[PDB]
Each structure stands twice: as C-alpha cells, then as structure tokens.
Write an enzyme that holds these catalytic residues in place. Structure first.
Site, PDB file in Angstrom:
ATOM      1  N   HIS A  37       0.840  -1.192   0.000  1.00  0.00           N
ATOM      2  CA  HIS A  37       0.000   0.000   0.000  1.00  0.00           C
ATOM      3  C   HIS A  37       0.873   1.238   0.000  1.00  0.00           C
ATOM      4  O   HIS A  37       2.069   1.179   0.243  1.00  0.00           O
ATOM      5  CB  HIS A  37      -0.916   0.042   1.228  1.00  0.00           C
ATOM      6  CG  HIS A  37      -1.803  -1.137   1.344  1.00  0.00           C
ATOM      7  ND1 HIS A  37      -2.939  -1.282   0.624  1.00  0.00           N
ATOM      8  CD2 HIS A  37      -1.736  -2.222   2.132  1.00  0.00           C
ATOM      9  CE1 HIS A  37      -3.523  -2.430   0.937  1.00  0.00           C
ATOM     10  NE2 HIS A  37      -2.816  -3.018   1.868  1.00  0.00           N
ATOM     11  N   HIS A  70     -28.229  12.172  -6.066  1.00  0.00           N
ATOM     12  CA  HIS A  70     -29.488  12.336  -6.769  1.00  0.00           C
ATOM     13  C   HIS A  70     -29.531  11.709  -8.146  1.00  0.00           C
ATOM     14  O   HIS A  70     -30.398  12.086  -8.953  1.00  0.00           O
ATOM     15  CB  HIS A  70     -29.977  13.783  -6.759  1.00  0.00           C
ATOM     16  CG  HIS A  70     -31.462  13.967  -6.733  1.00  0.00           C
ATOM     17  ND1 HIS A  70     -32.259  13.592  -7.812  1.00  0.00           N
ATOM     18  CD2 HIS A  70     -32.321  14.508  -5.826  1.00  0.00           C
ATOM     19  CE1 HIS A  70     -33.521  13.909  -7.506  1.00  0.00           C
ATOM     20  NE2 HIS A  70     -33.614  14.469  -6.302  1.00  0.00           N
ATOM     21  N   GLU A  92     -29.569  23.180  -5.332  1.00  0.00           N
ATOM     22  CA  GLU A  92     -30.424  22.025  -5.021  1.00  0.00           C
ATOM     23  C   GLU A  92     -29.582  20.756  -5.009  1.00  0.00           C
ATOM     24  O   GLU A  92     -29.714  19.934  -4.105  1.00  0.00           O
ATOM     25  CB  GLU A  92     -31.610  21.902  -6.011  1.00  0.00           C
ATOM     26  CG  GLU A  92     -31.326  21.628  -7.446  1.00  0.00           C
ATOM     27  CD  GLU A  92     -32.540  21.712  -8.368  1.00  0.00           C
ATOM     28  OE1 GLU A  92     -33.583  21.092  -8.112  1.00  0.00           O
ATOM     29  OE2 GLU A  92     -32.382  22.463  -9.363  1.00  0.00           O
ATOM     30  N   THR A  93     -28.741  20.611  -5.990  1.00  0.00           N
ATOM     31  CA  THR A  93     -27.888  19.475  -6.238  1.00  0.00           C
ATOM     32  C   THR A  93     -26.609  20.016  -6.854  1.00  0.00           C
ATOM     33  O   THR A  93     -26.601  21.061  -7.552  1.00  0.00           O
ATOM     34  CB  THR A  93     -28.628  18.571  -7.209  1.00  0.00           C
ATOM     35  OG1 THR A  93     -29.879  18.176  -6.668  1.00  0.00           O
ATOM     36  CG2 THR A  93     -27.837  17.319  -7.485  1.00  0.00           C
ATOM     37  N   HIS A  97      -7.305  -0.868  -5.425  1.00  0.00           N
ATOM     38  CA  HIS A  97      -7.217  -0.423  -4.025  1.00  0.00           C
ATOM     39  C   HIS A  97      -8.227   0.674  -3.721  1.00  0.00           C
ATOM     40  O   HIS A  97      -8.854   0.643  -2.686  1.00  0.00           O
ATOM     41  CB  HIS A  97      -5.803   0.045  -3.703  1.00  0.00           C
ATOM     42  CG  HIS A  97      -4.849  -1.102  -3.544  1.00  0.00           C
ATOM     43  ND1 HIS A  97      -4.160  -1.318  -2.424  1.00  0.00           N
ATOM     44  CD2 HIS A  97      -4.469  -2.071  -4.394  1.00  0.00           C
ATOM     45  CE1 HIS A  97      -3.386  -2.388  -2.548  1.00  0.00           C
ATOM     46  NE2 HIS A  97      -3.565  -2.891  -3.756  1.00  0.00           N
ATOM     47  N   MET A 154     -10.007   2.194  -0.147  1.00  0.00           N
ATOM     48  CA  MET A 154      -8.800   2.818   0.387  1.00  0.00           C
ATOM     49  C   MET A 154      -8.664   4.282  -0.025  1.00  0.00           C
ATOM     50  O   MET A 154      -7.830   4.667  -0.854  1.00  0.00           O
ATOM     51  CB  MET A 154      -7.579   1.992   0.000  1.00  0.00           C
ATOM     52  CG  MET A 154      -6.604   1.952   1.139  1.00  0.00           C
ATOM     53  SD  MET A 154      -5.439   0.579   1.017  1.00  0.00           S
ATOM     54  CE  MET A 154      -4.316   1.277   2.227  1.00  0.00           C
ATOM     55  N   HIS A 166      -5.877   8.867  -1.347  1.00  0.00           N
ATOM     56  CA  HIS A 166      -6.192   7.471  -1.628  1.00  0.00           C
ATOM     57  C   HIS A 166      -4.912   6.676  -1.825  1.00  0.00           C
ATOM     58  O   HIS A 166      -3.870   7.242  -2.167  1.00  0.00           O
ATOM     59  CB  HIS A 166      -7.071   7.309  -2.859  1.00  0.00           C
ATOM     60  CG  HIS A 166      -6.543   7.849  -4.143  1.00  0.00           C
ATOM     61  ND1 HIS A 166      -5.677   7.128  -4.935  1.00  0.00           N
ATOM     62  CD2 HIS A 166      -6.711   9.028  -4.772  1.00  0.00           C
ATOM     63  CE1 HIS A 166      -5.375   7.881  -6.001  1.00  0.00           C
ATOM     64  NE2 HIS A 166      -5.986   9.046  -5.942  1.00  0.00           N
ATOM     65  N   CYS A 167      -5.011   5.359  -1.636  1.00  0.00           N
ATOM     66  CA  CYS A 167      -3.897   4.469  -1.968  1.00  0.00           C
ATOM     67  C   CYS A 167      -3.737   4.443  -3.468  1.00  0.00           C
ATOM     68  O   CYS A 167      -4.723   4.600  -4.214  1.00  0.00           O
ATOM     69  CB  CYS A 167      -4.219   3.098  -1.422  1.00  0.00           C
ATOM     70  SG  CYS A 167      -2.927   1.877  -1.561  1.00  0.00           S
ATOM     71  N   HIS A 221     -27.471  15.876  -2.694  1.00  0.00           N
ATOM     72  CA  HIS A 221     -28.698  16.626  -2.507  1.00  0.00           C
ATOM     73  C   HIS A 221     -29.214  16.349  -1.110  1.00  0.00           C
ATOM     74  O   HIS A 221     -29.291  15.182  -0.664  1.00  0.00           O
ATOM     75  CB  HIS A 221     -29.711  16.181  -3.566  1.00  0.00           C
ATOM     76  CG  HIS A 221     -31.062  16.782  -3.411  1.00  0.00           C
ATOM     77  ND1 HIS A 221     -31.412  17.925  -4.044  1.00  0.00           N
ATOM     78  CD2 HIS A 221     -32.176  16.446  -2.715  1.00  0.00           C
ATOM     79  CE1 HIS A 221     -32.636  18.281  -3.752  1.00  0.00           C
ATOM     80  NE2 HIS A 221     -33.145  17.409  -2.946  1.00  0.00           N
ATOM     81  N   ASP A 256      -1.508   8.713  -1.727  1.00  0.00           N
ATOM     82  CA  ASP A 256      -1.502   9.873  -2.621  1.00  0.00           C
ATOM     83  C   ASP A 256      -2.432  10.923  -2.031  1.00  0.00           C
ATOM     84  O   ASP A 256      -3.645  10.662  -1.920  1.00  0.00           O
ATOM     85  CB  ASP A 256      -1.948   9.462  -4.025  1.00  0.00           C
ATOM     86  CG  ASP A 256      -2.245  10.491  -5.083  1.00  0.00           C
ATOM     87  OD1 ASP A 256      -2.296  11.713  -4.835  1.00  0.00           O
ATOM     88  OD2 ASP A 256      -2.478  10.085  -6.289  1.00  0.00           O
ATOM     89  N   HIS A 258      -4.145  14.448  -2.760  1.00  0.00           N
ATOM     90  CA  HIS A 258      -4.404  15.455  -3.782  1.00  0.00           C
ATOM     91  C   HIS A 258      -4.071  16.883  -3.312  1.00  0.00           C
ATOM     92  O   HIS A 258      -3.949  17.787  -4.117  1.00  0.00           O
ATOM     93  CB  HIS A 258      -5.849  15.410  -4.279  1.00  0.00           C
ATOM     94  CG  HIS A 258      -6.182  14.190  -5.060  1.00  0.00           C
ATOM     95  ND1 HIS A 258      -7.401  14.066  -5.658  1.00  0.00           N
ATOM     96  CD2 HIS A 258      -5.511  13.068  -5.409  1.00  0.00           C
ATOM     97  CE1 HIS A 258      -7.486  12.950  -6.322  1.00  0.00           C
ATOM     98  NE2 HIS A 258      -6.361  12.262  -6.208  1.00  0.00           N
TER      99      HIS A 258
HETATM  100 CU   LIG Z   1      -3.759  -0.017  -0.830  1.00  0.00          CU
HETATM  101 CU   LIG Z   2     -35.266  15.144  -5.484  1.00  0.00          CU
HETATM  102 CU   LIG Z   3      -5.977  10.588  -7.210  1.00  0.00          CU
END
Ligand SMILES: [Cu+2]
Ligand SMILES: [Cu+2]
Ligand SMILES: [Cu+2]
Ligand SMILES: [Cu+2]
Ligand SMILES: [Cu+2]
Ligand SMILES: [Cu+2]
Lengths: 333, 333, 333
Positions: free
Chosen positions: A89, A300, A273-274, A139, A144, A129-130, A249, A92, A94
C-alpha cells in the site's frame, strides 16, 4: 525555513462521519501537524443481504478519516502497514505537490512503516487514496480513500468576503464497489486477493458499480447512526468520491453555499439544489437548517441512492415553521 | 405575517415545452400563487418502434408543466390523485424547505387530494418530482417529474448586474427511461404495476437507460413541434433532469449566459458550448439567435442524443449573416 | 466590412499533443486565418493487445489538430475528402454560429473539397467534430473530432484581471471507442463500414466504452512521447471530449487556474484537484510546475484511466523542493 523550529501538534483522528476537533480560524502560526494511520485489510458486510467483501482501509473505516489542517501547515503522516496485512500500500494526497502526491515515497509492504511530510499550500477539501503502481483502481474501489481539509487561515468566506462559520461538520465518503458477478448475476464466492484480481478487473471494466454507499455500507448513516442537527445550526458536509462522479442533494433542504469542486479560494455557489462532485474530488456544502424532522441526504441519481445504497439521513430537532411550509388541506377523499 | 392578507392569483398551466404567462419583473408584492395538478397514469408510446410504457404523470405530460413564481411568493398546490389511478403518489419540490420537499405531507392514494403551501425563498429553476417512500426512482423514471422557476423579483441579471430579459421561454424536460429487457434484448411484455416492479428495479440497477427523450418521446420536439425563434430574439431554455446528468448543447449556437445548476443569485457562465446539468437539477440557458435555419438542441453525449432520443430542433426565421458564416467554396470535385 | 481587405495568414498545423505556433496577445488586427485539413480513413491499433479499428480522422490523427486563432478573427477552412476514402464527412465547429456549426455547409463525398469561413466571435477552447446527418455518433466515436482555441486578443487573464501567460501548451484529446463485442466478450472481426454499422450502433447504445484513450491509443503519451516540462514552467493543457464526460487530474499537481468548460470570458476556478469537462466540450488548465519527476495525467475515474487507457505522463526536469514534500522516514521495517 527550518521546519524543526515550528510547533508540532499531534492529531488524534476519529471515525467518519465525525471529524477530529480543530479551529476554523488558526489560533497559531504555521505548524507541523502529525497524523498516524494504520492500514487494515478486513472483511466488511456492505449491504442488507449480507454481501461480504475484502475491504482495504485506512484506520479501519471506509472512508478513511478526515484530516484537518490550515493552509501552509505541514502534514506529517506516519503510515503503518502491519504484518497482519498481505498487500503493498501507499498514499496519494491530492492536497500535496510532488512524487505522485506522495505515492512514490510511501510504498509500504506488510511489516513496514514510513513517514511523509508535505506542505499544504492550497486551501480546500481534497481526496487522499492508496495508489500502488499497476493496481490503483482496485485499491481505491476496495475502500482505500478518504479526504483532507486544508482550511484558510482565516476560516471560510462567502461570495462577498464575509465569514462563514459552521457549528457542526460531517464527512460523508461515498464508495463505488464492483463486486464480481457470475453470469446469472450473483456475487462470486474469492479465496485470496490474487485469485480475486482478474475478476475484480473485469468487474471494474463494466463501469457499473454493484453498490454505492456512504460510510461503508447500505444504511450506515441511518437509524442510531443518522446525522443530527438542530434548527438554526450551521452545518458543513464534506463529501468525497475518489473514483466516480456523484451529485449530492439534501432532500428538504439546499446547499446554501457550495464548493462543489472543493477549493476555498473560489467563491461558493449559492442556493444549490444538487451539486456535481467529479470523481477524484472532494466538495463541501454549508447549510443552515430551518425546519425539523427527517431529511435524506442522497446522490441524486435516485437509482444510485435508493437501489444501490447512496442515501443517509439527518434527524433535526426544533420548532416547525408553518410560514415556510404547511399542509393546508391534509390528504383526504 | 398573516398569509390570508396577501393577494391570491390562480395560474392556469400549459403543456411543455410551453410555459404559462408570467412577468419577469414582479408587478405586485408577494402573492400566494395557486396551482392545481391532477396525476394521470397512462400508456405512452415513447419511440418510433412503438414501444409503449405505463407512464406516471403530473397533468398528463412528461415532463410535468413548468410552474413560475417570484422569490418570496408562496406556492399553494392542490394535488389530485383521481380514483382512475392505481398507485400512491406525492410531490417533492426542490424549491421548498422542510418535510422532504413536501413529500412527507402530500401522500395521496387514488381518490384523494391534498393542498400544500410553501414559501419560495430561493431564486432559481428547481426540479419537482414524485417520491413515495420505498418507490422513489420507479416513479421518477416513469416520468413523474417537472420543474418550477422562482424568478428574482427584479428579473434576471448578467454577470455584471445588468438586466437580462428573454423574449421567449421554453421548458425541455429530459427523461431517462429503463424499459426492462429480456436476455435477447427485447423489451418485455407487464400486466400490472406490481408484476412490473421487480423487473423495473432490475432494469434501473443496470444504470443504462433504454431511452433518453425530450418532452416524453423520441422526436417530440421536431417537425410540427419544433421549437421556434427569430433572428435577434432572446430565448431562455429551462432544462431539467430529475435523475441523471445531462449536457445540453445548441448545435450552431451557444449558451450566451448559462446557470448550469440553475440558481440565479450566482453569476451566469458566459459563452458556453455545452453545460453539465447534474441529475436532480434544473438549469437555464439564455441565447440570442444570430442566424436563421434549423438548429438541433441535444444532450451532447451524441449516442444519447441521436441513438437514444435526446434531441430536438429549433426552426429559426430571418436573415442569413454571411459575415458570421459563409460557404466560400461549396462542396465540389 | 469587406473581408477581402483583411490580412490573410496561413497556418501549418502540427500533430497533437503539440500545437502550431501562435501569439497569446494578438500582434495584428483581425485576420482571416487559413487552415487546411485532409480527412483520412485509416486502420489504427489502439491498445497493447493489438486491437485494430477503422478510424476516421482529420489530418491523420486522433484527435484532429488544435487550431488557434484570436477572438474576431475569421477561420477559413479548406476541408478535403480524397477519393481514397469511402465515406461522406463534414465539420461542425462549436466555436461557430449558424448552419449546425458548419456541418450543413461542408458535406464532402470522397473526391470533393469545400471551403468554409466563420467569424470566431467568442473566446475559449471549443470542440470541432464531423457530424453527417444520421451518422453523427459513429463518426465522432471513430475519432473524427479535435478542438479550436479562440484566444482573447489580449491573452489570458486570472480571476483578478491580471495576465496569465503560458510557456508551453499541449492538447490532449480524449477518445471513447465502442469496439463491438461478441457474447463471449471478444472484439468482433468487420469487412466494410456498412457491414460494421449496425454492430457499431449496438455497441454505442451500451453507453460503455471499450477503450478511453489520449492521443489515439493506450500509452500514446508515455515513454518517448511523454509530455515534458521544467520546474517553474507555466503549462496550459487543453483537453477535449467530444462525446462523453471526463474529469482530468494531474497526479502530484493541480490545475492552478482552470476553465473547466473552456470559456475565457469567465474567471477560472482556482486550485482544482480534478475538474469536470462535459462531453461535447473543451476545457483548459494552467499549472506552474513546482517539483520534478514523473507525473501522471489522468481521467480520475481510475478505472477509465488505468484499465481503459485514459492516462498519460509528464516528465519534469529540475530541482526537488524538500520544503514542499519530503520522505522523513523512508519505508522500513
Ligand atoms: Cu492499498
Ligand atoms: Cu429530489
Ligand atoms: Cu488521485
Ligand atoms: Cu408517483
Ligand atoms: Cu466523418
Ligand atoms: Cu457537437
């Protein structure tokens, strides 16, 4: 600057959807913020039918815990891969710059640990994330992944530059799982990760999740684990999706201020709304509750929500406002 | 405030893509705006092959009609479920606050009616849809959704605060249908809604629509039902998708001003070629026509448009501008 | 205005991901900018397995080349369909106004050519693609699409109105292919385009690409064809997707300034981790590299990236900054 001259503060993480204590407005100068996570491979039951998968987790949960720092703090992560696990493992971020987000520097076999440091130069919510070379989507889609929030040093601001202060925060991680199926449509019964790998790849290549869940399982954020608020409370909901688009939503509410792609130097979108959170992104929505009762918080695509699992609840206490909504004539013949 | 002291105005709705008459700039103070809709379950033919489904509609159409009010008006809806229908229905307004958008207050069995009131506190275009507990995606994806526009009291504004005034408005509802298929790929032939429910759920869980249509059927907004405009006219196109992302595009034109996620307190995006409207959202695009002729209005997943149905036409009258576009040398050997 | 009084400048296009030389700030008044493209139907191998398709290209490449002009220039395209091809083709520019983007004016059978002129009235990056009536998605998803950049006459600007100047530019075209499969899952082996058409339509209607690639093939932007930069260089990456949503991400970096839907009159989004480019759109991201090494540039549906092909690399030269990121304790028992 000599990082050894800066304060160090150790954070003790908590299980999503809760978030470790922090300050919105930084009460100190830049710090080295110390985190530890221990990878755990474990069986998880993810639906009401009892489907059990081999999950890959940071700190025992899907999603991994939310980390919170301020802009231009340093994040120092000790990442532990105990010898009870079987796979390689890494991680990363971001939020980070360089070395594939940290992944090139953090490859840990079972029985190894590592410590990574990076400067959190950009404010926002971000996925982590891995990402082991050659096996990345397996993964990630085994659970992960999590998120990190890098707050501006003077906290959040609205579209006019005015402060926005939340009373409560929750972290909703949304996970697409790809449980391999046989021709008849039943989930296959694998003996080891290597025996599972090709059918996991096949399943992923359909681009059709079998399950889409919040906090690791169908129903995880319902009943005794519903989210809670009171009328008048300001709530921030951080939502991440490391691999696939989602569209959150709040049923019966709104996102009053939303950073749909999660980056706080940008003005928020108002009155949503969304919102679309692209795969590989974290977003954040701020809402002030105005009515009590049950709310559903969903993706949604309502099929994804109600048939595949991407739905949770809020239970909100307080006074009902009949000016805002009322039944004039209740259902009747 | 005593709502009984406010003016009441009754709206008479019209069939999409047309929109009931209204004022962009409010000519009165806040009002209670009275709407009535009658639910109709009916057979609809949705493609050129003759595929017939059991649709669930507000007011006999897919989509349901566009409702138009101003910010801080009250919406008072009488919702009627006649005894000729067979299912339980309700309504959720994304414009509203509380009680799951109204759905918790509006459950009507066949032979019942109800009246809901809510205050339209946020400006924008919003989805409304049926949402009966436990059966939500089936009702939505059977056509039971529409939209409501809550205009700012001083009408629409551009990114600089200047007025934007449309000459014409259209409402395009986009509907994803999930017609169950047998193993060979043909649409199944069901006897009742309950006999259809499990295969409807199965079909939805594929996340692959069989049909994606505007105004209820392949070709509905073509030929004698094409949308129309003249060169120089300002047109607002409201577009909703209650369940799945779409990406509208005017072939040969642009969205000069677009609220892709539909909320008018935000500045519009300028000069869009294509915009993403997330599932569960309504958006709005403003365009001033500059050339005559046929335009196609599409979801720019071109498979979704041209193979599954998500395409309509504009027929635009007026002068051709050869400065803006011309054939210098017509096709020739 | 008499277009014959304006300067004419002929552009000589280059193969993606490179871009023909141009000026960011216009050094002349408006011009007629002359382009030529020759359509080529050709076999292309698109993956490591050797899968070979019948591609449809502008100028021999997938994607077609990036065209660059300034706002209110005129684009004059000579489009050639040699008699060695077998199909009818045309071109639709999303930058243009009228006649279905040009498609109604540019239908060329094998052995024909045409010349189209249009005024580039809106700044931004835009898709162009073939669009023959009745066969649109088949031509687009066979590779017949590219992009055009219409720069503001005074170049790019940040969210505050300050100049943004790139040192390098790259064009990444992302292509969804739908290679028909038999029941067992193998790609079918067709004799002519007409014999292929129905199974191409069937394959497209699944809405599930078999391949999603950058610059025409798995791995095309890796190894000796990796993208390159140096620490401190400002890079603009133009990314288009003519048919399906994508969500670009620079692994180990950010989009410092992103026009996700590609239109430069709008302020850019800052500090993006991942951005959504809707199908039918071009977007652009500006980044200043801060660390050397290998970066992956991906669609952050990681299945789409690492299993279906939507991944490239940057190789970046220069100094490592241990303040921004370092391994404190390298992996160890
Ligand atoms: Cu992993
Ligand atoms: Cu709705
Ligand atoms: Cu990424
Ligand atoms: Cu219903
Ligand atoms: Cu073509
Ligand atoms: Cu197009």
């Amino acid at each position: 600057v000599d990082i050894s001259t800066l304060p160090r503060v150790k954070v003790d993480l908590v299980k999503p959807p809760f978030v470790h204590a922090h300050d919105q407005v930084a009460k100190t100068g830049p710090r080295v913020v110390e985190f530890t996570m221990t990878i755990e491979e474990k069986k998880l039951v993810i639906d009401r039918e009892g489907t059990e998968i081999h999950a890959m987790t940071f700190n025992g949960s899907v999603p991994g815990p939310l980390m919170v720092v301020h802009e231009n703090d340093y994040v120092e992560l000790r990442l532990i891969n105990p010898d009870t696990n079987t796979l390689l493992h890494n991680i990363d971020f971001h939020a980070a710059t360089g070395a594939l987000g940290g992944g090139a520097l953090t490859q840990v076999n079972p029985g190894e640990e590592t410590t990574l440091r990076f400067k959190a130069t950009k404010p926002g919510v971000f996925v982590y994330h891995c990402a082991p070379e050659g096996m990345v989507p397996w993964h990630v889609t085994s659970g992960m992944n999590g998120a990190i929030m890098v707050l501006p040093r003077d906290g959040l601001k609205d579209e006019k530059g005015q402060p926005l202060t939340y009373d409560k925060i929750y972290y909703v991680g949304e996970q697409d799982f790809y449980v391999p199926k046989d021709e008849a449509g039943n989930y296959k019964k694998y003996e080891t990760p290597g025996e599972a790998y090709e059918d996991a790849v096949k399943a992923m290549r359909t681009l059709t999740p079998t399950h889409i869940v919040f906090n690791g399982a169908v129903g995880a954020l319902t009943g005794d684990h519903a989210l809670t608020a009171a009328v008048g409370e300001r709530v921030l909901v951080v939502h991440s999706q490391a691999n696939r688009d989602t569209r959150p939503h709040l049923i019966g509410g709104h996102g009053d201020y939303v950073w749909a792609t999660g980056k706080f130097r940008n003005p928020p979108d108002l009155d949503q709304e969304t919102w679309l959170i692209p795969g590989g992104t974290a977003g954040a929505a701020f809402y002030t509750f105005r009515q009590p009762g049950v709310y559903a918080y969903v993706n949604h695509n309502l099929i994804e929500a109600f048939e595949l699992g991407a739905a949770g609840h809020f239970k909100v206490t307080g006074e009902w406002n009949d000016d805002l909504m009322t039944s004039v004539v209740k259902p009747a013949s």
